[PDB]
Design a protein around this motif. Structure first.
Motif, PDB file in Angstrom:
ATOM      1  N   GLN B   2       1.069  -4.959  -2.601  1.00  0.00           N
ATOM      2  CA  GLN B   2       0.303  -4.255  -3.620  1.00  0.00           C
ATOM      3  C   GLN B   2      -1.137  -4.740  -3.688  1.00  0.00           C
ATOM      4  O   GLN B   2      -1.439  -5.908  -3.423  1.00  0.00           O
ATOM      5  CB  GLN B   2       0.952  -4.410  -5.004  1.00  0.00           C
ATOM      6  CG  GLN B   2       2.399  -3.941  -5.090  1.00  0.00           C
ATOM      7  CD  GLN B   2       2.543  -2.437  -4.947  1.00  0.00           C
ATOM      8  OE1 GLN B   2       2.571  -1.707  -5.939  1.00  0.00           O
ATOM      9  NE2 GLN B   2       2.649  -1.967  -3.710  1.00  0.00           N
ATOM     10  N   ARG B   3      -2.026  -3.812  -4.050  1.00  0.00           N
ATOM     11  CA  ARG B   3      -3.445  -4.128  -4.176  1.00  0.00           C
ATOM     12  C   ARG B   3      -3.696  -5.088  -5.336  1.00  0.00           C
ATOM     13  O   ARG B   3      -4.476  -6.038  -5.203  1.00  0.00           O
ATOM     14  CB  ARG B   3      -4.255  -2.837  -4.313  1.00  0.00           C
ATOM     15  CG  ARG B   3      -5.481  -2.790  -3.404  1.00  0.00           C
ATOM     16  CD  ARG B   3      -6.443  -1.651  -3.735  1.00  0.00           C
ATOM     17  NE  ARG B   3      -7.265  -1.892  -4.915  1.00  0.00           N
ATOM     18  CZ  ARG B   3      -7.136  -1.237  -6.060  1.00  0.00           C
ATOM     19  NH1 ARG B   3      -6.208  -0.308  -6.224  1.00  0.00           N
ATOM     20  NH2 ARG B   3      -7.954  -1.524  -7.068  1.00  0.00           N
ATOM     21  N   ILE B  27       1.738  -5.193 -14.815  1.00  0.00           N
ATOM     22  CA  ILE B  27       1.477  -4.032 -13.974  1.00  0.00           C
ATOM     23  C   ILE B  27       2.682  -3.103 -14.106  1.00  0.00           C
ATOM     24  O   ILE B  27       3.830  -3.551 -14.003  1.00  0.00           O
ATOM     25  CB  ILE B  27       1.225  -4.417 -12.499  1.00  0.00           C
ATOM     26  CG1 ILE B  27       0.310  -3.426 -11.806  1.00  0.00           C
ATOM     27  CG2 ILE B  27       2.453  -4.368 -11.676  1.00  0.00           C
ATOM     28  CD1 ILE B  27      -0.974  -3.346 -12.446  1.00  0.00           C
ATOM     29  N   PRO B  29       4.047  -0.262 -12.116  1.00  0.00           N
ATOM     30  CA  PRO B  29       3.898   0.521 -10.882  1.00  0.00           C
ATOM     31  C   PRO B  29       4.241   1.995 -11.001  1.00  0.00           C
ATOM     32  O   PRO B  29       3.599   2.814 -10.329  1.00  0.00           O
ATOM     33  CB  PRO B  29       4.867  -0.202  -9.928  1.00  0.00           C
ATOM     34  CG  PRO B  29       5.873  -0.829 -10.882  1.00  0.00           C
ATOM     35  CD  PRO B  29       4.948  -1.400 -11.895  1.00  0.00           C
ATOM     36  N   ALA B  30       5.225   2.371 -11.822  1.00  0.00           N
ATOM     37  CA  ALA B  30       5.662   3.767 -11.824  1.00  0.00           C
ATOM     38  C   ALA B  30       4.603   4.730 -12.360  1.00  0.00           C
ATOM     39  O   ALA B  30       4.396   5.800 -11.776  1.00  0.00           O
ATOM     40  CB  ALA B  30       6.952   3.902 -12.633  1.00  0.00           C
ATOM     41  N   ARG B  31       3.911   4.382 -13.448  1.00  0.00           N
ATOM     42  CA  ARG B  31       2.914   5.289 -14.016  1.00  0.00           C
ATOM     43  C   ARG B  31       1.496   4.935 -13.541  1.00  0.00           C
ATOM     44  O   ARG B  31       0.523   5.600 -13.913  1.00  0.00           O
ATOM     45  CB  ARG B  31       3.058   5.364 -15.550  1.00  0.00           C
ATOM     46  CG  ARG B  31       1.942   6.111 -16.274  1.00  0.00           C
ATOM     47  CD  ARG B  31       2.402   6.796 -17.540  1.00  0.00           C
ATOM     48  NE  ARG B  31       3.806   7.178 -17.478  1.00  0.00           N
ATOM     49  CZ  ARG B  31       4.757   6.609 -18.205  1.00  0.00           C
ATOM     50  NH1 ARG B  31       4.486   5.627 -19.049  1.00  0.00           N
ATOM     51  NH2 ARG B  31       6.014   7.026 -18.071  1.00  0.00           N
ATOM     52  N   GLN B  32       1.386   3.951 -12.653  1.00  0.00           N
ATOM     53  CA  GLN B  32       0.130   3.475 -12.061  1.00  0.00           C
ATOM     54  C   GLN B  32      -0.987   3.080 -13.046  1.00  0.00           C
ATOM     55  O   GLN B  32      -2.113   3.570 -12.962  1.00  0.00           O
ATOM     56  CB  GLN B  32      -0.380   4.548 -11.081  1.00  0.00           C
ATOM     57  CG  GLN B  32      -1.038   4.023  -9.811  1.00  0.00           C
ATOM     58  CD  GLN B  32      -1.123   5.031  -8.665  1.00  0.00           C
ATOM     59  OE1 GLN B  32      -0.562   6.124  -8.724  1.00  0.00           O
ATOM     60  NE2 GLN B  32      -1.847   4.657  -7.613  1.00  0.00           N
ATOM     61  N   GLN B  33      -0.667   2.200 -14.006  1.00  0.00           N
ATOM     62  CA  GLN B  33      -1.633   1.643 -14.972  1.00  0.00           C
ATOM     63  C   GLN B  33      -1.613   0.120 -14.862  1.00  0.00           C
ATOM     64  O   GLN B  33      -0.747  -0.457 -14.202  1.00  0.00           O
ATOM     65  CB  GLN B  33      -1.428   2.016 -16.435  1.00  0.00           C
ATOM     66  CG  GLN B  33      -1.737   3.412 -16.777  1.00  0.00           C
ATOM     67  CD  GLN B  33      -0.490   4.024 -17.255  1.00  0.00           C
ATOM     68  OE1 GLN B  33       0.576   3.699 -16.746  1.00  0.00           O
ATOM     69  NE2 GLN B  33      -0.586   4.917 -18.227  1.00  0.00           N
ATOM     70  N   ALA B  34      -2.483  -0.536 -15.634  1.00  0.00           N
ATOM     71  CA  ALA B  34      -2.597  -1.993 -15.596  1.00  0.00           C
ATOM     72  C   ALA B  34      -3.230  -2.539 -16.864  1.00  0.00           C
ATOM     73  O   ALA B  34      -4.303  -2.088 -17.275  1.00  0.00           O
ATOM     74  CB  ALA B  34      -3.460  -2.437 -14.417  1.00  0.00           C
ATOM     75  N   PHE B  70      -5.713   2.969 -15.520  1.00  0.00           N
ATOM     76  CA  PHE B  70      -5.304   3.376 -14.177  1.00  0.00           C
ATOM     77  C   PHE B  70      -5.760   2.379 -13.115  1.00  0.00           C
ATOM     78  O   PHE B  70      -6.877   1.857 -13.169  1.00  0.00           O
ATOM     79  CB  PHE B  70      -5.820   4.777 -13.841  1.00  0.00           C
ATOM     80  CG  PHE B  70      -4.973   5.883 -14.397  1.00  0.00           C
ATOM     81  CD1 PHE B  70      -5.152   6.369 -15.681  1.00  0.00           C
ATOM     82  CD2 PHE B  70      -3.974   6.434 -13.611  1.00  0.00           C
ATOM     83  CE1 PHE B  70      -4.344   7.391 -16.163  1.00  0.00           C
ATOM     84  CE2 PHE B  70      -3.172   7.444 -14.081  1.00  0.00           C
ATOM     85  CZ  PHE B  70      -3.354   7.926 -15.359  1.00  0.00           C
ATOM     86  N   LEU B  71      -4.877   2.108 -12.142  1.00  0.00           N
ATOM     87  CA  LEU B  71      -5.187   1.138 -11.094  1.00  0.00           C
ATOM     88  C   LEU B  71      -6.322   1.608 -10.201  1.00  0.00           C
ATOM     89  O   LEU B  71      -6.935   0.781  -9.518  1.00  0.00           O
ATOM     90  CB  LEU B  71      -3.967   0.768 -10.238  1.00  0.00           C
ATOM     91  CG  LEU B  71      -2.573   0.721 -10.842  1.00  0.00           C
ATOM     92  CD1 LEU B  71      -1.480   0.684  -9.767  1.00  0.00           C
ATOM     93  CD2 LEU B  71      -2.562  -0.504 -11.697  1.00  0.00           C
ATOM     94  N   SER B  72      -6.606   2.909 -10.160  1.00  0.00           N
ATOM     95  CA  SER B  72      -7.707   3.359  -9.320  1.00  0.00           C
ATOM     96  C   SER B  72      -9.026   2.815  -9.853  1.00  0.00           C
ATOM     97  O   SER B  72      -9.922   2.470  -9.073  1.00  0.00           O
ATOM     98  CB  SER B  72      -7.744   4.885  -9.254  1.00  0.00           C
ATOM     99  OG  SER B  72      -9.079   5.353  -9.147  1.00  0.00           O
TER     100      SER B  72
END
Ligand SMILES: [Mg+2]
Ligand SMILES: [Mg+2]
Ligand SMILES: [Mg+2]
Ligand SMILES: [Mg+2]
Ligand SMILES: [Mg+2]
Ligand SMILES: [Mg+2]
Ligand SMILES: [Mg+2]
Ligand SMILES: [Mg+2]
Ligand SMILES: [Mg+2]
Ligand SMILES: [Mg+2]
Ligand SMILES: [Mg+2]
Ligand SMILES: [Mg+2]
Ligand SMILES: [Mg+2]
Ligand SMILES: [Mg+2]
Ligand SMILES: [Mg+2]
Ligand SMILES: [Mg+2]
Ligand SMILES: [Mg+2]
Ligand SMILES: [Mg+2]
Ligand SMILES: [Mg+2]
Ligand SMILES: [Mg+2]
Ligand SMILES: [Mg+2]
Ligand SMILES: [Mg+2]
Ligand SMILES: [Mg+2]
Ligand SMILES: [Mg+2]
Ligand SMILES: [Mg+2]
Ligand SMILES: [Mg+2]
Ligand SMILES: [Mg+2]
Ligand SMILES: [Mg+2]
Ligand SMILES: [Mg+2]
Ligand SMILES: [Mg+2]
Ligand SMILES: [Mg+2]
Ligand SMILES: [Mg+2]
Ligand SMILES: [Mg+2]
Ligand SMILES: [Mg+2]
Lengths: 110, 111, 64, 95, 204
Positions: B2-3, B27, B29-34, B70-72
């Motif tokens: 993972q990043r 973290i 992972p499923a909903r891609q937030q942090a 969001f992880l982006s």
RNA sequence: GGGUAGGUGGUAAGAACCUCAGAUCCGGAGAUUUCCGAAUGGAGCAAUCCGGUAGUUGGAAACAGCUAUCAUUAAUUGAUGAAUAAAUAGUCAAUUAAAGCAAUACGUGGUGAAGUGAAACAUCUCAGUAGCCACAGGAAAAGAAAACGAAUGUGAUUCCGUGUGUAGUGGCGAGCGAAAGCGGAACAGGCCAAACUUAUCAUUAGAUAGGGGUUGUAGGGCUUGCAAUGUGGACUUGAAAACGAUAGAAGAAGCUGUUGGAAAGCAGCGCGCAAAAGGGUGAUAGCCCCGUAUUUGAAAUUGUUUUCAUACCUAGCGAGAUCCCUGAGUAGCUCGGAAAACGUUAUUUUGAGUGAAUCUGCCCAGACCAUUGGGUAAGCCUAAAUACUAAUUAGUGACCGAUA
RNA sequence: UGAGUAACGCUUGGGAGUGAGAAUCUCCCAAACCGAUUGACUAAGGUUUCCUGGACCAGGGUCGUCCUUCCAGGGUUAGUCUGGACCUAAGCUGAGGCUGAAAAGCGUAGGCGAUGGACAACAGGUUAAUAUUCCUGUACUUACAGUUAGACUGAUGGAGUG
């Protein structure tokens, strides 16, 4: 991981494990129904460990009830008060039984 | 792999908060937030509820917590470099331990 | 069923054509007539068979 | 024998009314497929004192939470009323 | 539909007609069937053409061809200039797997075809998966490097064995040619030209 | 096995735990699998009730736990055995198979209408459709000429185009409508019976198990020689290799300023590309993220193909004898029906009856006879092209976008 | 729109109290109807509608603090009661078997099938809700084992009764 440790164990020790965990499982369920179980996760751990033990015992063509029926040890401690109550009950029963027949017999004689 | 992992320093590259450095506490992972500490501070209007031994008091006023991001929008922060900069990472595998390790692509810094 | 026991040949369904070519479905039944034969130690066992099979048994010496 | 026919003890007003005055009456919930003899045997092998008699109750399933978006049915219970002899009172919790 | 009892009816007659037709003796013939069918030939008296047919069979087997494909190739070569008895020989020998077998990196022609179909084979102005492409007299066929990564190598040796109409350097995996196979390199297994006339009658 | 740093399924926060001796998660292979249900120990109002037998553990026994087994039919074998001596019927036991379901879809067979059209209606059409039933299969059916048919002809079956809405068939009305030939897809032909011979059955064999044979420019058997040790299959077991399927790994390239809640928009200056398919990221991102192109990887299960060996089948051309065999209630014929485009007729089929011949033989070429010619019925098996999609994977849409 | 119209489907007065709000809810006193019934016990059916506390989104032909409505908790105890473990009637099913294009129909031996036959418990008390079931008192019936005494035991069949 856990399966390796139990695999190292013999068969007779495993059936001893199953009876102890079965008893412990009953106690946890009873305590939970009475609200005195602080740790509510131990039900799942015993059941999973119980299920795991069944898996190792079923690899070899051996059961858990029949194997324990051949040899076992009896019970203890739960005997004194039981016989006191039972002796009292049969004594009371015999007093009523004896009294009833006497009443009927002397009445028929008269 | 993972990043973003739990613990490494991270910053934000977009939004109202620019250049917000923080530590990822958790973290999803499923909903891609942090969840990053110190960033995305929201203030739930804490009401009062009394139905439990702890709820008998449940002192809650203007508690400020953490909102997920969001992880982006997250980007790894460099530490080994003398001049710290924000860049992207690789997934090189060093034969010394045969374990995958993150390495930046604008430098040669591990993790 | 109305069928032979040696073979499996059964009824034949067809049309009943008359004057004015009126169509009505009809059935031709086979002549199931009892017959006794000698098989397995000559054991006679009455078997309902078609006259055609009866002629076949007679010519094949089976019917004796 | 296997002792899966003793699921859960239950404490209600009726249970506590019986559970006082010399002979004690303990009400448990048992396997709906179990019989009275199995209940007595399970009590023998896990407590140690012979029941004087056993009574059984079947509570039929019924609709619950009616009108709620998703309605649901109840769960089938078999109740057993053990009565121990005079002067003996064992604890359901603690062994 | 009841107790048919085949014993009851079969023995009931012991010969009859239904009895003998079914007569369980019925063997397997499960090897007789296959082999004889397999493939036959010989020449007869009334049609002459028997020779043509047998020769056609041999030629197709030598290269593993279906008769339909053969009719297609004959149609292609038929129209051009003239007495093309030099053209169709090149056409029949221009098969990619055929070139692969005469190139020497496979033990047998069909095995070479299997290789070709499995994507071993690299060409020049193109690449190749289908084992039926017509190659041009002067064409290269560089062999893959992955096949050599699977050293069975035994092949390279066959490569040098070669036949003069193929020029291939072993190990280095490369091949081309010129002076297309003369009739000497097309041995007496099938060396006749009235099979051509057989296909002229059957194929316009 | 892969793969990590999170996990304890959704409406769902919290409490309490698990997890770096490698968790959760994904893939392969296994374990457990209550009751009803083909249900099959017996019953029954489905998910219930009542058991038998053989073990084993407690009890002093009744009894109660814990196991295994107990339906029917068909085939084989063995035992027992009636009227009635023998023998069967029957009875019992053991072993092996069958039951049922579904894919609102394809196949075969049996049965089989009516609405309607003919501007009415009965022949006819609708239509051998709907429906009912039986049997399957991964396809099924069909299949190697007693053929087409008019020629110095083609040479199993199946499917597509044309021949043509042609020849014909029709209360000659409504209508129905091929078979040749030609062009294509695929292509494959096999095997018994009888002769003759071997061995055995109170050898009354007329039966069982082998060798021999599979046909049409007739074949085979009988006797006598030459040449043969191969080629090929619809093929058994193994071994090896290759191509895949069921998890994955790596995978390039951007900052600044402006409006704005928020930039990815806009503008300036750049960069990558075998990646400009797509999704998300606070608006409209090739360079923010996941991915995509491309290069790769399987412990275990499984599919296709190839190589080698190995069982099992498979083989030519003569001579003489003039002898034998070549599928019978069968082909024909009569009486009622039908199949073929045909409303019954040369060809095919059959409910009733009758009934032939044996290569100088039999059938066919639209009644029938003769000449000519074609072909070998009354025995069996047969891949491919063909029909369909409930389901698994990938993907597409001048298809729909909550009355569709 | 008709139209705030028809209708609201047989039963009175008052005092006190609760409540933010009472003709409608609670208590009390009367009053009026039922009384071969609107009274009490149950079969069938209904399937939690039963008891307690709370609520007044919706339902109640008005109102409602209240309800057979909703929420939470609780409630149904059998050797003797009603039915199986006992038996049969009409009828159903029905191995073999008979009949029938197929599916199937009929039917023997067996097996089901009460609305019938056989079979041992009565009185009182107790909880908000269960009671021949729980408790008290007094009984009875059927099995198994040991024991004492006497007696030869006598059915899958026959007969009588039922
Ligand atoms: Mg008609
Ligand atoms: Mg009861
Ligand atoms: Mg693992
Ligand atoms: Mg009509
Ligand atoms: Mg009409
Ligand atoms: Mg009309
Ligand atoms: Mg077939
Ligand atoms: Mg690959
Ligand atoms: Mg990756
Ligand atoms: Mg990338
Ligand atoms: Mg984009
Ligand atoms: Mg004829
Ligand atoms: Mg017709
Ligand atoms: Mg002839
Ligand atoms: Mg013949
Ligand atoms: Mg809709
Ligand atoms: Mg709508
Ligand atoms: Mg209106
Ligand atoms: Mg109005
Ligand atoms: Mg008015
Ligand atoms: Mg008015
Ligand atoms: Mg009014
Ligand atoms: Mg009223
Ligand atoms: Mg009133
Ligand atoms: Mg009155
Ligand atoms: Mg009443
Ligand atoms: Mg309700
Ligand atoms: Mg109430
Ligand atoms: Mg209330
Ligand atoms: Mg109201
Ligand atoms: Mg009692
Ligand atoms: Mg009964
Ligand atoms: Mg009754
Ligand atoms: Mg009551």
């Amino acid at each position: 991981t856990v399966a390796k440790e139990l695999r190292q164990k013999s068969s007779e020790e495993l059936v001893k494990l199953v009876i102890k965990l079965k008893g412990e499982l009953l106690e946890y369920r009873f305590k939970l129904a009475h609200g005195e179980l602080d740790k509510p996760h131990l039900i799942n751990q015993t059941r999973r460990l119980l299920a795991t033990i069944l898996t190792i015992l079923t690899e070899r063509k051996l059961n858990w009830q029949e194997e324990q029926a051949k040899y076992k040890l009896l019970t203890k401690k739960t005997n004194e008060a039981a016989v006191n109550a039972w002796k009292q009950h049969l004594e009371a029963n015999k007093a009523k039984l004896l009294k009833s027949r006497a009443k009927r017999e002397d009445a028929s004689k008269k | 792999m993972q990043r973003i992992k739990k613990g490494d320093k991270v910053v934000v590259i977009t939004g109202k908060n620019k250049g917000g450095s923080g530590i990822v506490l958790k973290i999803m992972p499923a909903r891609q937030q942090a969840i990053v500490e110190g960033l995305n501070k929201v203030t739930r209007h804490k009401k009062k509820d009394q139905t439990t031994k702890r709820a008998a008091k449940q002192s809650t006023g203007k508690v400020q917590q953490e909102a997920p991001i969001f992880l982006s929008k997250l980007a790894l922060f460099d530490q080994k470099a003398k001049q710290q900069t924000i860049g992207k990472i690789k997934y090189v595998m060093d034969p010394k331990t045969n374990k995958k390790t993150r390495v930046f692509k604008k430098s040669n810094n591990t993790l | 069923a109305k069928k032979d026991q040696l073979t499996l040949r059964g009824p034949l369904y067809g049309n009943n054509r008359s004057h004015s070519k009126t169509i009505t479905r009809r059935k031709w039944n086979v002549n199931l007539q009892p017959c006794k034969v000698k098989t397995a130690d000559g054991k006679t066992t009455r078997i309902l068979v078609s006259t055609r099979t009866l002629r076949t048994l007679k010519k094949h010496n089976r019917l004796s | 024998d296997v002792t899966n026919v003793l699921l859960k003890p239950v404490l209600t007003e009726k249970v506590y009314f019986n559970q006082m005055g010399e002979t004690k009456k303990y009400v448990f919930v048992v396997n709906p497929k179990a019989s009275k003899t199995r209940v007595k045997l399970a009590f023998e092998l896990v407590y140690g004192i012979k029941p004087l008699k056993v009574n059984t109750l079947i509570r039929k399933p019924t609709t619950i939470r009616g009108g709620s978006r998703f309605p649901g049915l109840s769960k089938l219970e078999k109740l057993a009323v053990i009565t121990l002899p005079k002067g003996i009172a064992i604890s359901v919790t603690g062994e | 539909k009841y107790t048919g009892s085949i014993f009851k009816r079969s023995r009931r007659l012991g010969f009859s007609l239904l009895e003998n037709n079914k007569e369980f003796s019925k063997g397997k013939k499960r090897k007789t069937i296959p082999g004889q069918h397999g493939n036959r030939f010989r020449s007869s008296t009334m049609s002459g053409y028997a020779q043509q047919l047998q020769e056609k069979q041999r030629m197709q087997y030598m290269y593993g061809i279906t008769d339909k494909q053969f009719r297609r190739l004959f149609r292609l070569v038929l129209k051009q200039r003239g007495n093309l008895a030099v053209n169709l020989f090149r056409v029949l020998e221009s098969r990619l797997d055929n070139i692969v077998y005469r190139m020497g990196f496979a033990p047998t022609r069909r095995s070479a075809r299997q290789l070709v179909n499995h994507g071993h084979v690299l060409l020049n102005d193109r690449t190749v998966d289908t084992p039926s492409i017509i190659l041009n007299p002067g064409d290269k066929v560089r062999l893959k490097a992955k096949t050599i990564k699977i050293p069975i190598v035994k092949a390279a040796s066959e490569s040098g064995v070669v036949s003069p109409f193929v020029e291939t350097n072993n190990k280095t995996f490369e091949g081309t040619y010129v002076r297309f196979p003369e009739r000497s390199e097309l041995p007496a297994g099938i060396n006749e030209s009235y099979v051509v006339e057989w296909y002229k009658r059957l194929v316009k």
